[PDB]
Amino acid sequence: DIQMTQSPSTLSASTGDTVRISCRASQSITGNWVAWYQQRPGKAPRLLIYRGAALLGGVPSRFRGSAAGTDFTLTIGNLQAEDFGTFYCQQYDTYPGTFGQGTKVEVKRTVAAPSVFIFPPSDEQLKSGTASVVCLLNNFYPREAKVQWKVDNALQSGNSQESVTEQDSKDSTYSLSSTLTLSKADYEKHKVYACEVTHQGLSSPVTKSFNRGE
Amino acid sequence: NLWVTVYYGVPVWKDAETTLFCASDAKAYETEKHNVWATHACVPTDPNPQEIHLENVTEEFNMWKNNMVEQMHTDIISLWDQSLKPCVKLTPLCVTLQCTNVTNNITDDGELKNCSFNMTTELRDKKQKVYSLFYRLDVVQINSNKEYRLINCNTSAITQACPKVSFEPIPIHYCAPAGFAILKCKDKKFNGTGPCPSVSTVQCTHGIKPVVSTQLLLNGSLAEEEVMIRSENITNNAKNILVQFNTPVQINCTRPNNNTRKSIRIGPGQAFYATGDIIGDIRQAHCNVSKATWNETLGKVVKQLRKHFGNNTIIRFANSSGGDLEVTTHSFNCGGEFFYCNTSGLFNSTWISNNDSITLPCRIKQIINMWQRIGQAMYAPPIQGVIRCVSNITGLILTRDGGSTNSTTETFRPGGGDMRDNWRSELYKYKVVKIEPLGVAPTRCKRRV
Amino acid sequence: AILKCKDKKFNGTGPCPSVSTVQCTHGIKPVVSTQLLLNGSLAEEEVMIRSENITNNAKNILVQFNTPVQINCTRPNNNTRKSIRIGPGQAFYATG
Amino acid sequence: FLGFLGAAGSTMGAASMTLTVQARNLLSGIQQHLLKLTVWGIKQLQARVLAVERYLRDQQLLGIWGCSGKLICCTNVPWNSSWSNRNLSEIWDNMTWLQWDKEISNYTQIIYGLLEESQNQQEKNEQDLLALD
Amino acid sequence: FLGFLGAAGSTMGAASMTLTVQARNLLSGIQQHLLKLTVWGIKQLQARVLAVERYLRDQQLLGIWGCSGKLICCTNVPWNSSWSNRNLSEIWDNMTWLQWDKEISNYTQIIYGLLEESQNQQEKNEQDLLALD
Amino acid sequence: QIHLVQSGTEVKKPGSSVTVSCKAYGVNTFGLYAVNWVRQAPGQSLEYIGQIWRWKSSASHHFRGRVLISAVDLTGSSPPISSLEIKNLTSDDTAVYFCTTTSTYDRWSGLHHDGVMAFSSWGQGTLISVSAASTKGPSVFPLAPSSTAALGCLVKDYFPEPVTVSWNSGALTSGVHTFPAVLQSSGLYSLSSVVTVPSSSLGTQTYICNVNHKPSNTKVDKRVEPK
Ligand SMILES: *[C@@H]1O[C@H](CO)[C@@H](O[C@@H]2O[C@H](CO)[C@@H](O[C@@H]3O[C@H](CO[C@H]4O[C@H](CO[C@H]5O[C@H](CO)[C@@H](O)[C@H](O)[C@@H]5O)[C@@H](O)[C@H](O)[C@@H]4O)[C@@H](O)[C@H](O[C@H]4O[C@H](CO)[C@@H](O)[C@H](O)[C@@H]4O[C@H]4O[C@H](CO)[C@@H](O)[C@H](O)[C@@H]4O)[C@@H]3O)[C@H](O)[C@H]2NC(C)=O)[C@H](O)[C@H]1NC(C)=O
Ligand SMILES: *[C@@H]1O[C@H](CO)[C@@H](O[C@@H]2O[C@H](CO)[C@@H](O[C@@H]3O[C@H](CO[C@H]4O[C@H](CO)[C@@H](O)[C@H](O)[C@@H]4O)[C@@H](O)[C@H](O[C@H]4O[C@H](CO)[C@@H](O)[C@H](O)[C@@H]4O)[C@@H]3O)[C@H](O)[C@H]2NC(C)=O)[C@H](O)[C@H]1NC(C)=O
Ligand SMILES: *[C@@H]1O[C@H](CO)[C@@H](O[C@@H]2O[C@H](CO)[C@@H](O[C@@H]3O[C@H](CO[C@H]4O[C@H](CO)[C@@H](O)[C@H](O[C@H]5O[C@H](CO)[C@@H](O)[C@H](O)[C@@H]5O)[C@@H]4O)[C@@H](O)[C@H](O)[C@@H]3O)[C@H](O)[C@H]2NC(C)=O)[C@H](O)[C@H]1NC(C)=O
Ligand SMILES: *[C@@H]1O[C@H](CO)[C@@H](O[C@@H]2O[C@H](CO)[C@@H](O[C@@H]3O[C@H](CO)[C@@H](O)[C@H](O[C@H]4O[C@H](CO)[C@@H](O)[C@H](O)[C@@H]4O)[C@@H]3O)[C@H](O)[C@H]2NC(C)=O)[C@H](O)[C@H]1NC(C)=O
Ligand SMILES: *[C@@H]1O[C@H](CO)[C@@H](O[C@@H]2O[C@H](CO)[C@@H](O[C@@H]3O[C@H](CO[C@H]4O[C@H](CO)[C@@H](O)[C@H](O)[C@@H]4O)[C@@H](O)[C@H](O)[C@@H]3O)[C@H](O)[C@H]2NC(C)=O)[C@H](O)[C@H]1NC(C)=O
Ligand SMILES: *[C@@H]1O[C@H](CO)[C@@H](O[C@@H]2O[C@H](CO)[C@@H](O[C@@H]3O[C@H](CO[C@H]4O[C@H](CO)[C@@H](O)[C@H](O)[C@@H]4O)[C@@H](O)[C@H](O)[C@@H]3O)[C@H](O)[C@H]2NC(C)=O)[C@H](O)[C@H]1NC(C)=O
Ligand SMILES: *[C@@H]1O[C@H](CO)[C@@H](O[C@@H]2O[C@H](CO)[C@@H](O[C@@H]3O[C@H](CO)[C@@H](O)[C@H](O)[C@@H]3O)[C@H](O)[C@H]2NC(C)=O)[C@H](O)[C@H]1NC(C)=O
Ligand SMILES: *[C@@H]1O[C@H](CO)[C@@H](O[C@@H]2O[C@H](CO)[C@@H](O)[C@H](O)[C@H]2NC(C)=O)[C@H](O)[C@H]1NC(C)=O
Ligand SMILES: *[C@@H]1O[C@H](CO)[C@@H](O[C@@H]2O[C@H](CO)[C@@H](O)[C@H](O)[C@H]2NC(C)=O)[C@H](O)[C@H]1NC(C)=O
Ligand SMILES: *[C@@H]1O[C@H](CO)[C@@H](O[C@@H]2O[C@H](CO)[C@@H](O)[C@H](O)[C@H]2NC(C)=O)[C@H](O)[C@H]1NC(C)=O
Ligand SMILES: *[C@@H]1O[C@H](CO)[C@@H](O[C@@H]2O[C@H](CO)[C@@H](O)[C@H](O)[C@H]2NC(C)=O)[C@H](O)[C@H]1NC(C)=O
Ligand SMILES: *[C@@H]1O[C@H](CO)[C@@H](O[C@@H]2O[C@H](CO)[C@@H](O)[C@H](O)[C@H]2NC(C)=O)[C@H](O)[C@H]1NC(C)=O
Ligand SMILES: *[C@@H]1O[C@H](CO)[C@@H](O[C@@H]2O[C@H](CO)[C@@H](O)[C@H](O)[C@H]2NC(C)=O)[C@H](O)[C@H]1NC(C)=O
Ligand SMILES: *[C@@H]1O[C@H](CO)[C@@H](O)[C@H](O)[C@H]1NC(C)=O
Ligand SMILES: *[C@@H]1O[C@H](CO)[C@@H](O)[C@H](O)[C@H]1NC(C)=O
Ligand SMILES: *[C@@H]1O[C@H](CO)[C@@H](O)[C@H](O)[C@H]1NC(C)=O
Ligand SMILES: *[C@@H]1O[C@H](CO)[C@@H](O)[C@H](O)[C@H]1NC(C)=O
Ligand SMILES: *[C@@H]1O[C@H](CO)[C@@H](O)[C@H](O)[C@H]1NC(C)=O
């Protein structure tokens, strides 16, 4: 099998920009049997380029690819709003055809501090016998951010899950949900619940918290 | 170490388009007839159809993409035009008519109009009243006794055929210009699409006849073990259905009326061979197909239907719905006269789970503007004698109607009018390639200094 | 081969250093006009004075334009299209 | 025999030991008082002109080259291994035309350029200088 | 590049290190349902015939000679100094076509006669006798 | 025109089999087009499963012998169709499955390389979820505001996907972030949907989220009263 190593994993650009995505193969593909695909979230991929320099009927002229030896490059000049998404390189020189890890193309925006909110578990959820704690991070950029949960001023791991929106079309910001789940008996025992957030837009780690009862 | 080497004549070929050329037998030029109908200046046929089977060739085919269906279509109708140019024109003929119903027999009772008319002659200063007998299909009335002129006399000019030429479809091999090649799919069952292992190359084709027939095939090639189901898009209903015959079907199309010809002088150098007396009685043209062979034909066809379209359904037959006379009839020449046969009885059957010839009425028409190239209509001069032409039926042209049910029954109806299904049905499994001889192979061989 | 005199000022006669070879010409229109030029090529910096024999009076004078001249030639009469049958196959579209 | 294109389902070794029978195929084809208005021979002789002119573009190649016949010919043109990377077993044992033709389309461009460059540079010039003695 | 006739304002040294680009120029040129009465292609294909026949008189020369291609070729034909009396500096430094062409019209006659005579005499005959061993 | 429509989303339990259908409309025949089946794991890269070209079935070594890919040509009733059958499902097979159509008539296309090819036509996608859990309606809990502020709903322990969340019966759409589903340790899905509104309007206007789960045919309306 051929191993397609794509690069970079994520890139940010703006409209009209010229952007280049690279894709290396484990072996050298002389015949230039490599294709490029665009996939916006939820919808099916589109075949943009096959065999390196060949544009598929209907794909804009601003998409052009180049193939030399092992390295391959997809070039998007005059970046358009419709072009943002995820891109994949695919080889088909040896069976089986293999795709790359992919490359995400996000919008540029000024760095944005996250609005942090903490939500204690619902009283009704307690009558079900389970307790869920949620920390909300909203309207922030860039997407790199780390959350840790501090209960009775002690670290907690292995029981927290995260969920993230896709970039907002209007403001080019993201939003994240950190859900901490644990047993009902343990919750009452723990004294206090805290959410500490580390992000670039904040001068020092912002911590927003609540003690049981309000 | 490595250098390169350059090779010539390597088996490298792609597809291309060009103009082929004919290969007529020299035997038909002994019957030259002052340009026997098709062959005028053709090539003599090579008596050796050099066919080399090609192992390990599996080329995807389609009988719906690339051929001289259109090109040789325009070549045949261009031959029609080149026949129509130097021969007899019928320009002063748009004269009003005084016609009466014939009185000899009841088999046409009508349709035969004893049309008297004024005319001039050689001596530009002279006149000439005359009467002639015409079939109802060559004229139309206009609104005392009814008057009738000609349907083309407000649309298009009229010529008649110069009587020296023939009308026979000639077996003509179609050969390729060299530097190219013609391929052949030698399998048994081939609906026209897909790959083919059974590949042979021939310099030419076989001898191919320009057959003019609607709704069927006459004197064409015969299929293999089964009758095939050939089309392009059976999911589409607008596509026709080509069914080449495993077994040919005998037919006896007759003009059973002995006739006479009246040559009247419209000249100088012009003249018109009008209809003389029908010597004997009045009959209609008709054709005969034995009923049992027809039943076995319908049964084998409907077995191929339950092979191809579904497996368990009802197959019920209706005739043509209507339209043009050439559309509604299996329409075809019989030597020099064009039989338009009422094919209504041949499409009366129903198929669900499980010594007599059949005689159908046929109609003859002379003023024809075939292929609808309007601007020039053709006239057929009359022929004496009872004409009996033995043709043999060699295929089918049918339509799929609208389904509109949940596979309850299927009504299939005649079709045609294009003649390009005759072209493709007589010209599938063949293709046109271009040849590339140049090869370059790197190795460690080197020239000297 | 076809050659080309690529100078600025050239009355049609004499030598030319500015020589280029082209396989073809440019796209050339069959223009039918008397006394002038319509949609033709445009001259360089000056309008040229091209003839053969200006000492002769029978020769005409060709003056190619530096600057093209706008003109609005109109048939300002809306008309009708008739068609009378002289046939068969003949007919004449007369003035409505 | 193999006849015409009998080396089709083969390899270029066994094909390369053949194909002069395939090479000798440019012309194999070769009634004037009836009415003398013909149309067929115009396009037929036209096709003869087009086939001959095709073969003389081929002889324009087979002329101006280092491969004046020389039905097949070796060269002095080198080979970059960045171009292809196969073995003589991998090609001469089993690889004959298809993607081989696609690669020698790339080096139809590049390597026919190298036929022009190798022809101009010192196949004639050094031949003149060593010839001038 | 020099392109087409780029060695025009040069000397036959610097011209002679070129001109295969100039040599590869005999063919560079390479709608039937409207009314099918044409006149242009008769004279156009006629001109293609005349150009090809011209090039094949040229290949009749470049065939029957001691200069079967051999894009340029040296000889074994001598030179009388009564014919011309210049130096290789005087020609190869600066003298290229014009009266050079007039002189090689005189020895187009005489020296093409010497191509026929040098070809007949012992370029083939002594080649046969030394070949017959 | 040619697109490609696949079967509906299916939920299956481990060890089961499954067959996904793919109607190829616009495709003239599978003699001139090839069918490739590719799956995309959740938030992952794509993976080749198999194909069918020249009426020859095949599968990748990783999926070799575990999958059966059949196709049938055009009929007068229906366009040509391919079928991807996968036996003995595991949780690692939860992915979206795509139909691929690429023309095969021309040898030089450069879309295909001796059966190994790129993918010119694609389908909507079939979500194949493999989990031991059975259908379950979501328990919805409120995320209440306290102390511009934000509130939300917590949709938890629903299977399978998806759930749709709306606010005030669609009246409130601005500032609404519905997070994608996460799959819990219990093999169940859970997400939250939050809203940012001016705190000054917390007592004025009432906020309700509308969750609907068609798989269980469950629809809940939960009031998010502040605390
Ligand atoms: C599918 O294919 C089948 C098989 O091909 C087609 O069946 C063919 O159908 C044709 C009509 O559609 C029919 O053509 C007529 O043939 C007649 C026979 O011609 C041959 O023989 C004559 C003379 O021989 C005759 O007598 C001897 C001795 O007794 C017998 O042994 C013979 O059998 C004959 O009876 C030769 O002269 C010919 O060269 C042939 O060898 C022809 O006579 C007839 O042509 C006549 O009419 C033409 C138009 O007017 C005219 O140009 C021509 O000159 C002929 O004129 C005859 O009569 C006039 C009367 O005035 C007289 O002056 C002439 O001297 C002459 O006697 C047709 O050509 C085919 O015979 C028939 N069979 C075959 C095997 O081809 C089928 O039609 C086809 N399907 C379709 C849709 O086309
Ligand atoms: C090895 O060799 C092969 C062939 O020798 C090369 O493959 C070629 O790659 C080039 C890269 O540009 C291809 O060029 C592009 O082809 C596209 C497909 O062409 C088809 O469709 C067009 C449009 O209908 C037809 O005109 C054409 O005949 C084909 O049917 C074209 O769409 C592209 O043209 C578009 O962009 C150009 C930009 O200049 C515009 O001018 C055009 O108007 C149009 O918008 C373009 O021509 C080429 O087709 C490939 N050929 C083959 C046979 O695959 C490899 O790249 C090569 N590799 C190396 C390393 O040498
Ligand atoms: C009388 O009319 C003629 C014809 O316009 C005027 O002559 C000048 O013509 C030249 C060309 O012969 C024009 O000058 C240049 O034209 C270049 C060629 O551009 C054409 O093709 C391009 C590629 O397909 C296309 O993009 C371009 O479109 C341009 O012009 C269009 C209108 O014709 C317009 O709709 C487009 O938006 C775009 O502007 C052309 O089809 C072009 O590349 C150069 O930019 C430049 O235009 C001149 O403009 C014409 N005018 C002048 C003043 O020189 C002639 O002058 C007219 N005389 C008078 C008195 O009006
Ligand atoms: C035009 O002609 C060609 C050639 O006759 C014809 O193609 C043929 O189609 C059939 C079925 O469409 C192919 O038969 C296949 O054989 C393989 C090998 O055993 C089977 O695995 C296939 O089974 C699949 O399809 C079945 C259909 O019901 C399913 O039940 C089954 O589950 C599988 O999905 C299948 O039977 C045959 O190989 C081809 N032949 C060629 C050369 O391609 C084509 O269909 C014709 N078209 C028309 C419109 O007539
Ligand atoms: C052979 O004839 C066939 C018809 O007898 C042709 O098949 C048709 O092909 C066209 C495009 O070529 C298809 O149109 C597309 O359909 C898809 C699928 O949507 C279909 O189903 C939805 C849901 O019920 C329905 O709403 C649509 O109306 C369609 O029926 C659409 O997504 C596309 O946008 C486009 O509309 C036809 O659907 C298709 N019909 C059938 C019955 O297959 C076939 O193209 C012909 N082949 C050739 C070469 O012409
Ligand atoms: C195509 O099929 C058509 C329909 O079968 C055929 O039409 C038949 O044509 C023949 C002549 O070729 C006609 O025969 C005539 O019959 C009448 C009546 O004869 C009957 O009575 C007399 C007196 O008792 C008796 O002698 C006869 O045997 C009959 O019993 C006779 O008077 C005539 O002389 C002549 O024989 C048929 O009537 C006619 N119809 C049928 C139904 O047979 C046509 O000939 C076929 N063509 C071909 C080429 O096969
Ligand atoms: C309609 O007529 C055609 C032409 O006669 C029949 O096709 C088949 O043609 C071949 C070649 O002429 C016949 O094979 C051989 O014919 C020669 C001379 O006729 C004869 O001496 C041989 O014994 C052999 O028959 C062949 O007989 C003929 N028929 C078949 C069934 O293959 C076509 O069959 C005719 N159709 C009908 C329904 O009569
Ligand atoms: C078509 O007509 C031919 C004769 O014109 C018929 O052929 C004859 O058939 C009988 C048996 O039915 C044989 O005994 C004769 O020897 C045949 N004669 C000839 C000349 O072929 C044929 O049967 C007719 N077919 C139909 C369907 O009417
Ligand atoms: C198809 O067959 C029917 C039955 O032979 C044809 O004629 C119809 O006959 C009935 C009998 O009462 C009339 O009521 C109809 O009016 C007839 N139809 C027409 C159009 O006149 C029908 O003509 C046949 N179609 C063709 C093309 O022959
Ligand atoms: C097929 O044709 C037969 C006659 O050839 C038609 O059968 C006739 O049907 C009518 C009533 O519709 C009866 O009065 C006749 O007695 C029948 N005659 C015979 C010989 O059966 C039949 O209806 C036709 N079928 C179709 C679908 O057109
Ligand atoms: C049409 O019938 C007529 C008469 O039945 C046939 O003509 C006769 O031919 C014989 C010789 O065979 C002559 O002796 C008679 O004088 C002719 N009589 C007439 C009235 O013409 C005639 O052969 C048949 N027509 C054809 C073309 O065969
Ligand atoms: C067509 O190709 C097959 C291989 O695909 C060739 O078959 C080989 O034939 C040689 C000589 O008979 C044997 O040594 C090989 O073992 C065969 N291999 C296989 C896989 O069958 C066949 O010879 C080719 N046809 C021609 C005319 O060369
Ligand atoms: C055109 O001719 C001039 C001379 O007539 C060439 O100019 C010479 O160029 C070379 C190289 O640059 C110099 O060394 C000489 O000194 C120049 N001589 C003169 C008199 O200027 C010029 O190169 C020619 N152009 C071409 C394309 O051949
Ligand atoms: C024959 O002509 C007479 C007179 O016009 C007419 O009344 C009669 O209907 C006609 N017969 C036919 C069948 O047209
Ligand atoms: C055909 O013949 C069979 C008997 O062999 C008979 O059962 C069937 O009804 C016949 N079909 C027709 C349409 O006459
Ligand atoms: C149709 O069904 C019959 C009876 O089961 C069977 O013999 C035949 O093979 C089937 N044909 C097809 C195409 O399935
Ligand atoms: C092959 O080698 C030549 C000489 O180094 C080089 O110019 C060329 O770029 C190489 N080929 C490729 C495809 O890089
Ligand atoms: C050159 O020498 C030959 C032999 O003497 C002589 O025949 C010829 O005439 C000489 N050339 C001229 C121009 O005299």
CSV table of C-alpha atoms in Angstrom, one decimal, chain B residues 294-365:
chain,number,residue,atom,x,y,z
B,294,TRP,CA,-44.6,-16.3,-37.0
B,295,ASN,CA,-45.8,-18.0,-33.8
B,296,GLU,CA,-42.4,-19.4,-33.1
B,297,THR,CA,-40.9,-16.0,-33.8
B,298,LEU,CA,-43.2,-14.3,-31.3
B,299,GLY,CA,-42.5,-17.1,-28.8
B,300,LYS,CA,-38.7,-16.9,-29.1
B,301,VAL,CA,-38.9,-13.1,-29.0
B,302,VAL,CA,-41.1,-13.1,-25.8
B,303,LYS,CA,-38.6,-15.5,-24.2
B,304,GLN,CA,-35.9,-12.9,-24.9
B,305,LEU,CA,-38.2,-10.3,-23.4
B,306,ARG,CA,-38.5,-12.4,-20.2
B,307,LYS,CA,-34.7,-12.8,-20.3
B,308,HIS,CA,-34.1,-9.1,-20.7
B,309,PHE,CA,-37.0,-7.0,-19.4
B,310,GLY,CA,-38.3,-8.7,-16.3
B,311,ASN,CA,-39.0,-12.4,-15.8
B,312,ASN,CA,-42.8,-12.7,-15.1
B,313,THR,CA,-45.2,-10.3,-16.6
B,314,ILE,CA,-47.8,-9.9,-19.4
B,315,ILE,CA,-46.7,-9.2,-22.9
B,316,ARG,CA,-49.6,-8.1,-25.1
B,317,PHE,CA,-49.3,-6.7,-28.6
B,318,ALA,CA,-51.0,-3.7,-30.2
B,319,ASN,CA,-50.3,-2.3,-33.6
B,320,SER,CA,-48.9,1.1,-34.4
B,321,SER,CA,-51.0,3.9,-32.9
B,322,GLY,CA,-51.0,6.1,-35.9
B,323,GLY,CA,-49.1,8.9,-37.7
B,324,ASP,CA,-47.5,8.9,-41.1
B,325,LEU,CA,-48.2,6.2,-43.7
B,326,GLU,CA,-44.5,5.3,-43.7
B,327,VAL,CA,-44.5,5.2,-39.9
B,328,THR,CA,-47.6,3.0,-39.6
B,329,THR,CA,-46.5,0.6,-42.4
B,330,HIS,CA,-43.5,-1.6,-42.9
B,331,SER,CA,-42.5,0.6,-45.8
B,332,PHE,CA,-40.1,-0.7,-48.5
B,333,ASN,CA,-39.4,-1.0,-52.2
B,334,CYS,CA,-40.4,-4.1,-54.1
B,335,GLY,CA,-38.1,-3.8,-57.1
B,336,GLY,CA,-39.4,-0.4,-58.3
B,337,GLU,CA,-42.6,0.0,-56.3
B,338,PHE,CA,-42.9,0.8,-52.7
B,339,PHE,CA,-45.2,-1.4,-50.6
B,340,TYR,CA,-46.8,0.1,-47.5
B,341,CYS,CA,-48.3,-2.9,-45.7
B,342,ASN,CA,-51.0,-2.7,-43.1
B,343,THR,CA,-49.1,-4.4,-40.2
B,344,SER,CA,-52.1,-4.4,-37.9
B,345,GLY,CA,-52.7,-8.2,-37.8
B,346,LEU,CA,-49.1,-9.0,-36.9
B,347,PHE,CA,-49.3,-7.1,-33.6
B,348,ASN,CA,-52.3,-8.9,-32.1
B,349,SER,CA,-51.1,-11.3,-29.4
B,350,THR,CA,-50.9,-11.7,-25.6
B,351,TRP,CA,-48.2,-13.6,-23.7
B,352,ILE,CA,-48.4,-14.1,-19.9
B,353,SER,CA,-47.1,-17.5,-18.8
B,354,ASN,CA,-47.3,-20.0,-21.7
B,355,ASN,CA,-50.6,-24.7,-42.2
B,356,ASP,CA,-51.6,-21.2,-43.3
B,357,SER,CA,-49.8,-18.1,-44.5
B,358,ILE,CA,-50.9,-14.6,-43.2
B,359,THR,CA,-51.9,-12.1,-45.9
B,360,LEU,CA,-51.9,-8.4,-45.2
B,361,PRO,CA,-53.0,-5.5,-47.4
B,362,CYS,CA,-50.2,-3.4,-48.9
B,363,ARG,CA,-50.3,0.0,-50.5
B,364,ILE,CA,-48.1,1.5,-53.2
B,365,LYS,CA,-47.1,5.2,-53.6
